[PDB]
């Protein structure tokens, strides 16, 4: 639905997308034109070098096509930008796995646990059986929130004293899920960027232990990051890629920010998929990401 999504993109079609439209009215294709759209690119947080990209796109695209007026530059940039976020389009696919892992990455403070209990709320609705680990092993209060999770909806959540090793709670969890016949087990991790590389050796510790007990776990790696805090989540999700190799994303807060240029940033910059955008609070405001009915939501005229 990309009308429903215009209302959650408001603040960023101020400069992206319907944006766009005072920029080019009335004029001429030239430097000048294209220097006051990287301005505006940049100001959306879409990042040095994705600008850089999209301008040099356009700049070819519109020389090609023999372009004579600005206003004809909208719909070249619908189509690369489009383009952009059509390379990270594909759906997570949880199935047919005994159980398909799910690995949730990122820093403290954006929402890692509360992500973990809407996706799994989202696949129990959909009548598969999930399990949470509660490898957040040092937080006391994340464990509890996983535990909050579990107990009001009848999902069993694996967890250890606190201060317990993170990666016996999951090696623990994967053997409970395969035991039961859970079709989706969904780990928590710790997330203290004090200590980069404490925290990534962790993290690789993490998947070589699932490893031993099933060659393809963990089936995603998925990092979630908040698209509030801008160029941060780009310098977050590089961390992580470089480090330990993601294969989706999640990216929350995305209403009401003037930061969603963000997007296109992550989507350029790594190639990873965006498997899921939070667009509210709610449960339900954790969406299936549509790069189509993104880019129609923020082009709308
Ligand atoms: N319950
Ligand atoms: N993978």
Do not use: C
Request: proline fraction near 2%.
């Amino acid at each position: 639905g990309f009308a429903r999504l215009k209302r959650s993109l408001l603040k960023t079609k101020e400069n992206l997308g319907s944006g766009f439209i005072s920029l080019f009215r009335g004029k001429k294709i030239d430097d000048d034109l294209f220097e006051e759209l990287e301005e505006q690119l940049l100001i959306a947080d879409v990042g040095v070098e994705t600008t850089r990209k999209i301008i040099t796109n356009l700049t070819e695209g519109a020389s090609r096509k023999q372009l004579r007026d600005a206003e004809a530059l909208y719909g070249l940039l619908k189509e690369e930008m489009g383009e952009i976020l059509a390379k990270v389009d594909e759906p997570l696919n949880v199935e047919g796995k005994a159980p398909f892992v799910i690995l949730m990455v990122g820093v403290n403070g954006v929402g890692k646990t509360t992500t973990i209990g809407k996706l799994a709320r989202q696949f129990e609705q959909q009548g598969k059986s999930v399990m949470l680990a509660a490898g957040d092993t040092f937080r006391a209060a994340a464990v509890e929130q996983l535990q909050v999770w579990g107990q009001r909806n009848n999902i069993p959540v694996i967890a250890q004293h606190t201060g317990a090793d993170s990666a016996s709670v999951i090696f623990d969890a994967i053997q409970a899920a395969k035991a039961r016949n859970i079709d989706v087990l969904i780990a928590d991790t710790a997330g203290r960027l004090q200590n980069k590389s404490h925290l990534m050796e962790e993290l690789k510790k993490i998947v070589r232990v699932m490893k031993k007990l099933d060659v393809e776990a963990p089936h995603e790696v998925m990092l979630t990051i908040d698209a509030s805090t801008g160029q941060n989540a780009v310098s977050q999700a590089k961390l992580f890629h470089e480090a330990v190799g993601l294969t989706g994303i999640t990216l929350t807060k995305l209403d009401g920010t003037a930061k969603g240029g963000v997007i296109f940033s992550v989507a350029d910059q790594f190639g990873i998929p965006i498997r899921y955008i939070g667009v509210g609070e709610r449960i339900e405001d954790l969406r299936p990401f549509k790069a189509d009915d993104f880019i129609e939501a923020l082009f709308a005229r």
